[PDB]
Design a protein around this ligand. Sequence first.
Ligand SMILES: CCCc1c(OCCCn2ccc3c(OC(C)(C)C(=O)O)cccc32)ccc2cc(C(=O)c3ccccc3)ccc12
Ligand SMILES: CCCc1c(OCCCn2ccc3c(OC(C)(C)C(=O)O)cccc32)ccc2cc(C(=O)c3ccccc3)ccc12
Lengths: 253, 261, 253, 261
Amino acid sequence: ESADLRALAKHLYDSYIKSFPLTKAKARAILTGKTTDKSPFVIYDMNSLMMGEDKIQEQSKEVAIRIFQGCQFRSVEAVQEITEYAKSIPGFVNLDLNDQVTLLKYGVHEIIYTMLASLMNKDGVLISEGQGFMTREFLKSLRKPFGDFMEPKFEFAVKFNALELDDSDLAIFIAVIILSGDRPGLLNVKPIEDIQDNLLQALELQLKLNHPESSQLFAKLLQKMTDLRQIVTEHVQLLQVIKKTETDMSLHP
Amino acid sequence: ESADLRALAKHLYDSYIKSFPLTKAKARAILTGKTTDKSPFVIYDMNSLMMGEDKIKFKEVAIRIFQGCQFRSVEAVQEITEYAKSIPGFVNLDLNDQVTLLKYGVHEIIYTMLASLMNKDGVLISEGQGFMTREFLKSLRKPFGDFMEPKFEFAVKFNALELDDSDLAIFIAVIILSGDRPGLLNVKPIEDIQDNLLQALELQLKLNHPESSQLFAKLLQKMTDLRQIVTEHVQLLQVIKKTETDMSLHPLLQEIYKDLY
Amino acid sequence: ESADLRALAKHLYDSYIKSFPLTKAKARAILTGKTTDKSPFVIYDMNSLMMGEDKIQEQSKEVAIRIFQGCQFRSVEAVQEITEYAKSIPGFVNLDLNDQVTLLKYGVHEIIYTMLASLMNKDGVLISEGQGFMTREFLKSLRKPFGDFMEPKFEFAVKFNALELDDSDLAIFIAVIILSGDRPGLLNVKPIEDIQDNLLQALELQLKLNHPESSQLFAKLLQKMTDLRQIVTEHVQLLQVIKKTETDMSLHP
Amino acid sequence: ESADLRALAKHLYDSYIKSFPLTKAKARAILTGKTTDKSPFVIYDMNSLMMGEDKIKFKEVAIRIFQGCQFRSVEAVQEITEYAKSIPGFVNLDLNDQVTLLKYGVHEIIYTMLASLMNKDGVLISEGQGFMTREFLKSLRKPFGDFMEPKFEFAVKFNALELDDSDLAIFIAVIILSGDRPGLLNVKPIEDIQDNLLQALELQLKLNHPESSQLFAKLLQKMTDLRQIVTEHVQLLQVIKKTETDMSLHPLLQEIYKDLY
Ligand SMILES: CCCc1c(OCCCn2ccc3c(OC(C)(C)C(=O)O)cccc32)ccc2cc(C(=O)c3ccccc3)ccc12
Ligand SMILES: CCCc1c(OCCCn2ccc3c(OC(C)(C)C(=O)O)cccc32)ccc2cc(C(=O)c3ccccc3)ccc12
């Protein structure tokens, strides 16, 4: 029944609302300018960044490295909200505990980049819960290894954003990502694929009802799942350059 | 010998009385209107269910009814365990065999005795204080609606055999003492008791239902219907891990369901 | 009429024979040594106990706790034989069903300790239907809470056994115990006391005819009924220490 | 609200399961004999210690045992850090506060969870593969023998409270979120979380131990025993600089012990 698939969609969208306080709808309002009153502080160079550093870690290092560190910090926060949203996907908590941990270990990065896109435009990204805005041009200008980190996330966002997904579409897409039966080291693949097949069904009906005029959006959306694997693999390999060739250490356990 | 067998039948009936407060006679007296004390509140839909719970003045719906089934089934296990201990020869058996026989017997016996509380229109709940309609139960959201109907289909046909409590006392003793439960260490001492219970069940039906042709065989055939209801239910349980969020049953039922057929 | 009271005694003694296969007469034969041929295996330490464990639950725990558990098991068996003997006491099955259950709930412990005495001497107790013999010294040696459990049963047995009751005396004494009109929660006290008054009469004549030389044995026997209440109360309070302060669980419902 | 608090309790229990492989239930199952896999080799003296190390076929003694304590305590820090991160609100705190709370919380939590592995006769070591006796540990050359006994005296009494893993999951979360650690920049956001954890701990004990009088207060009183064990241990550490030759602890523990109370 469609009605069951709609109620699952609805239930996913409500859990997503709780887990993630800065939604696409809210961020697009800030990127554009709905109800303009609390316009975020813009960080467009080294000067404005420090202006905005002691406007709100604290100064004691090279700026590229503190920005990079700040992203480590923020992405450990985001793993906690993602972990919470996962618990609400039907069937997920009744899976083997170790496979639960394995799905999250490998899912979380792909989910963080999908969600960052809601915070990005072609020119910069919302930071500190929509309070700052950092320009892509400034991120691009940082010294060489650090200059190339965010740029591939911006390229993906721009292409993903022209799909015009909303939060209720993304609530299901996020769940399909978590429940991927091909991650290394999963004990029971079959129960995970049975869950994902039900979420695939609900995703498909969601897009058909919400975007009747985008032909084959379901399929273009699945195909974005290869682009995401590649951003993750690129980003993981860029962490290797850091680990080897750098002097600063302060990382989240 | 006859006298042995009649005294076996009387013993089990007396202990069945002591172990199960809501017997068939009492459920039928309530269902029939015959009672002279109090008439059961009927739950036929979502508004009357709200009123039925909130008759508490003197989660969601499906989950909260599936949760009320658990508490009741926990209590029935205890009542059934108490009756087992009184079956001659049962407590003298290997302790692991006593455990295995209950682990497997108990749900067969739950469905058997749940027929006593059913007609084709619904089921008596809360010590016979409510009545939930078959149509309401069947209306429930996908999986949870699937749990209830096969129990009704069984009861309607078991119920046309017209067994009474004293017949039932021995039938249930026969179920418990089944020598084909997996993992039994000492099959023969169990089979020997089942044999003597079978002989008693036989005499009891001949004496109690002299006009009822092949009642004994028709009753043992029901034993196969029971086993299929239990295998169906256990398949339903797996559906509940996949479709639902945090499920994890009550401690005593997790044990009963752990590594079961 | 005495003749009615004698026929009741006789009828009680015959039911008792059926219900309880290891009688005082048989156990005293084994404690002493009539027809010596099948001399029970003696359990006098941890070594001989295990020698006798895999000579016949099975090994997987602390020995004090398995002995204690074994006694739970055996005493649930004995409740079934006692329940059966009760049905044969005239008037008992025609009492209120709930009062029948209440008399047995509270009577059964006092009866188990009266009957154990037939299996005891000053030095140990017959176990496994007269096949084993466990020494009092070994029970006494078990770790501290478990060491003190059986010792008060041995003290009572030694004092009760010097009364020299036989099975036909005990068949009536057991029946007088079951039919006690003072247990908590009895609905109809009066019909129970009318039955017990008839059993008291038969007991009195039994002892007068069987033990004419023991002055006032009837009265010394009634007085043993307070000693028995106290063993039961002591034993019930010793179960409280267990429930609170222990780690192992495996108990009969 | 109750539902909030029960779901807080379940969350912490689930993440406690994921972060600590040797839980109380498993250590007690091993200590109890209840396990069905493998029985621990006991070290009671110097000959059996040699055999216990050299059970490696499938420095001096005191120093080599004090060195094995370090490796284990390093791993427990990592496990405890992993559990901290999962405590709602913890990763959103000032980064220096997160560091300070761990710096101080971790040894309190080490002694707490070390009680799970103790009885009055000894301690389970190497993932429950060995057992070192209390008498052996106490026999050790002056200072090194002094390290062990106060831990046993604590465990015996903590252990008579009969907490289980799910109780423990919240107790340990309460310890971490202590707003009185020296050098904290932002006390109130921590205290607010401890408050909500306290409310949850309270409900959990009432529900899990309904017959256990003032369990909650008796458990918070243990928090003072813990702090005195940590101050005692740190005094023991200074003794080890004076009495011993080259000592210098492992990198991560030097950090934890650097400028501590
Ligand atoms: C022995 C259960 C009898 C029963 C009932 O009939 C059950 C028919 C099918 N059935 C038998 C067992 C069983 C069942 O058993 C479980 C607990 C899952 C099991 O043993 O594994 C689960 C679902 C259905 C089911 C329906 C509703 C009840 C509802 C209630 C309630 O207390 C209640 C709860 C909420 C609102 C109103 C009333 C009690 C018992 C019910
Ligand atoms: C978490 C430690 C548990 C533990 C153990 O119990 C420790 C009880 C008291 N205690 C807690 C922490 C601690 C302790 O911690 C240090 C590392 C100094 C610290 O954190 O600062 C130092 C001494 C004693 C001590 C005894 C022996 C062990 C021995 C071993 C071994 O691997 C081992 C080493 C050598 C020979 C046989 C076995 C591991 C753990 C042991």
